[PDB]
Amino acid sequence: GVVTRFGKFSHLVEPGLNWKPTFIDEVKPVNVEAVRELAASGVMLTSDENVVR
Amino acid sequence: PFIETVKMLDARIQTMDNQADRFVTKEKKDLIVDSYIKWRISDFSRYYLATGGGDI
Amino acid sequence: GRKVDYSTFLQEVNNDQVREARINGREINVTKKDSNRYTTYIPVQDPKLLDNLLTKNVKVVGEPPEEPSLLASIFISWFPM
Amino acid sequence: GRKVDYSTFLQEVNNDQVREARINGREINVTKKDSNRYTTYIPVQDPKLLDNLLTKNVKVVGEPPEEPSLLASIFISWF
Amino acid sequence: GRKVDYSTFLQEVNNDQVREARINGREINVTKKDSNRYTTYIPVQDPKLLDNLLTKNVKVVGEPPEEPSLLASIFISWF
Amino acid sequence: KVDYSTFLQEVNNDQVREARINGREINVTKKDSNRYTTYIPVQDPKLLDNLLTKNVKVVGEPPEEPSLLASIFISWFP
Amino acid sequence: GRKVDYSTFLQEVNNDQVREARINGREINVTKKDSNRYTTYIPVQDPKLLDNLLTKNVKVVGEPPEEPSLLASIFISWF
Amino acid sequence: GRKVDYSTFLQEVNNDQVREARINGREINVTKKDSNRYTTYIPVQDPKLLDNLLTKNVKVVGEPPEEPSLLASIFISWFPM
């Protein structure tokens, strides 16, 4: 995670429960660590004037 | 006290199971097979330098 | 906290985008394959819903009921006492 | 407000002039395609509603259940 | 309140003689095309009822959600 | 006081005159004026279908709810 | 009063060795041809139970729902 | 033991690997052939479940309903006196 001081690049926060008191400092929560997927498809021409999926 | 953290790194043998995936033989015939592989971490240093996330 | 539309959720899950669904009553916490989070609400009982999920390899989850604790229940009941 | 009939509602849904549908219990908060608005009530349990809604791209909304606050309830249970 | 039986209601619908009805609970109060007004009562849950109604092009009306207002009741129970 | 399955057997051969139903019970009104009581074991989807197949007159009637005056009684008599 | 599994109960009924089936709530008090008796519970609501009974030609016995009791309320609220 | 998703449970049963099952409203205890145990929750009402279980010849049981004793209710409500 990352936390900021009046919208400033600041110490990126270590995982878990961190237990530090700051109010003027704001934390943007999510930077998930996994493996993602984003699929694609369509119909495209060929060099020899054909169509495939 | 609050400026350090540790991550586990499993050392037991691990598995991975594929799914059906196409091939073609020599004589232009198409088969469908499956397989599983047994893997174990060899040296406990280069793993974290190369992987870097310790995620399997 | 983006609350989405039922129709949009069905369209997108049939478009093969979704990976997990935690159902508890009528709220569903959908998590896509792109790791984003949100919630959705079923309109009514949809006899075909459970099928439509499982037949496309989405990983479903069930959640237990919140039983009112007997001690605190009799406390608040006996709080007037 | 403007109250319409569930039946006639079924027919104009068959005639494709509606966009948005919001459902709570039995009510149907509507706004159709041409910005007109109206209201009707789900008579009884229906098997085939959501099919007729979804197959023709009728856009739908549900809204959460209203859970009463416990502290106010116990406080009024005092007196 | 002259009651025409649910079954007889079904056959007379088969005879296509009713104009409309407004549905509440399992009580069916109904207005039929010969200007007559009566009522009947639903025996048990009937799936096919609405389907047959739709096939008959008959008009059907829901009734707004009946509700016992929980304002007087609480304090009169404390009265 | 009579068997359900026998009741179905009996409705197959069309000796029922009228079907007067209320709640989970049916009092039997057949051709030969014999009367009795039958109990529904569990929800049956076909019962209505079976009866409607054989043109029997089938009536149900609204409930007899407990009187509110007695409700107030039970509320304050103790 | 021995408990016997639902699966075994189906294993018996589908092979027609039972006559007496007592239905109440979701309990079944079972009696076969040997006057031997036991009890079992139906785990869920099943549409195919009664059909399975009727087809294999086994007789039924069902009885009235338990009228509620007042006496507990009598004592607790009245004393 | 590890509580498991419903989809995993169905993939498992479809391979004839669950031995005994207990049903309580929507909570289930499961025992595999390999003598392990865990718990599962049925998200939404399912008509096709039970037959699917039966066809793959799995041992299915039920449990008694827990009726609270009226004397216990009298005790709790009499706690003022």
What single DSSP character describes residue B32?
Answer: E
- Quick check: G61 and G28 in contact, CB under 8 A? no
Query: Max Cα separation, chain E?
Result: 54
- DSSP labels, chain G: --B--HHHHHHHHTTT-EEEEEEETTEEEEEETTS-EEEEE--S--TTHHHHHHHTT---EE----PPP-HHHHHHHH-
Residue of C nearest to H27 (CA): C64
- DSSP labels, E11-31: HHHHTT-EEEEEEETTEEEEE
- Kindly give, in sequence order, each residue whose CB lies less than 8 Å from that of residue F47, ignoring residues fewer than 6 positions away: E44, F40
Give me F33's structure tokens: 């004026």
Note whether E touches G: 3 CB pairs or more under 8 A. no
d(CA F5, CA G54): 7
Name the residue facing C64 among H8, H41, H46 (closest C-beta).
Answer: H41
| β-bridge mates for residue F19, sequence order | F28, F58
- Classify residue A7 as left (phi > 0), alpha (psi -120 to 50) or beta: left
- Quick check: G28 and G41 in contact, CB under 8 A? yes
- Quick check: D37 and D2 in contact, CB under 8 A? yes
In the three-class reduction of DSSP (H, G, I as helix; E, B as strand; rest coil), residue C40 is classed as: strand
Q: Using an 8 Å CB-CB cutoff, list chain B residues near A35.
A: 55
- Resolution in Å, one decimal, please: 4.0
Q: What is the dihedral of CA A33, A34, A37, A38, to 10 degrees?
A: -10
Query: Which residue has tokens 């054909």?
Result: A50
The alpha carbon dihedral of D13, D18, D22, D28 has a sign of negative
At G54, give phi and psi (nearest 5°).
-65, -45
d(CA C23, CA C50): 10
Name the residue facing F59 among E6, E47, E77 (closest C-beta).
Answer: E6
- Kindly give, in sequence order, each residue whose CB lies less than 8 Å from that of residue H69, ignoring residues fewer than 6 positions away: none
Using CB atoms within 10 Å of the CB of residue F22, give its burial: 0 to 12 exposed, 13 to 18 middle, 19+ buried.
Answer: middle
- Kindly give, in sequence order, each residue whose CB lies less than 8 Å from that of residue F25, ignoring residues fewer than 6 positions away: F37, F38, F39, F40
d(CA D55, CA D62): 18
| β-bridge mates for residue A26, sequence order | A4
- Kindly give, in sequence order, each residue whose CB lies less than 8 Å from that of residue C77, ignoring residues fewer than 6 positions away: none
d(CA H9, CA D40): 42
d(CA H51, CA C76): 45
- Quick check: F60 and E42 in contact, CB under 8 A? yes
End-to-end CA distance of chain F: 38
Kind of pairing between the strands at B32-33 and B21-22: antiparallel
In the three-class reduction of DSSP (H, G, I as helix; E, B as strand; rest coil), residue E51 is classed as: helix
Residue of A nearest to B2 (CA): A18
How many other CB atoms are found less than 10 A from the CB of residue G7? 17
Note whether C touches A: 3 CB pairs or more under 8 A. yes
* Cβ-defined contacts of D13-22 (< 8 Å, 24+): D13/D52, D13/D53, D13/D56, D13/D58, D14/D52, D16/D56, D18/D58, D19/D58, D19/D59, D20/D59, D20/D60, D20/D61, D21/D53, D21/D58, D21/D59, D21/D60, D21/D61, D22/D60, D22/D61, D22/D62, D22/D63
- DSSP labels, A1-53: -EEEESS---PBPPSS------SSEEEE-----S---------EE-TTS-EE-
- Quick check: B36 and B17 in contact, CB under 8 A? yes
Name the residue facing A33 among B2, B5, B55 (closest C-beta).
Answer: B55
- Quick check: F69 and F30 in contact, CB under 8 A? no
Give me G69's structure tokens: 């009791």
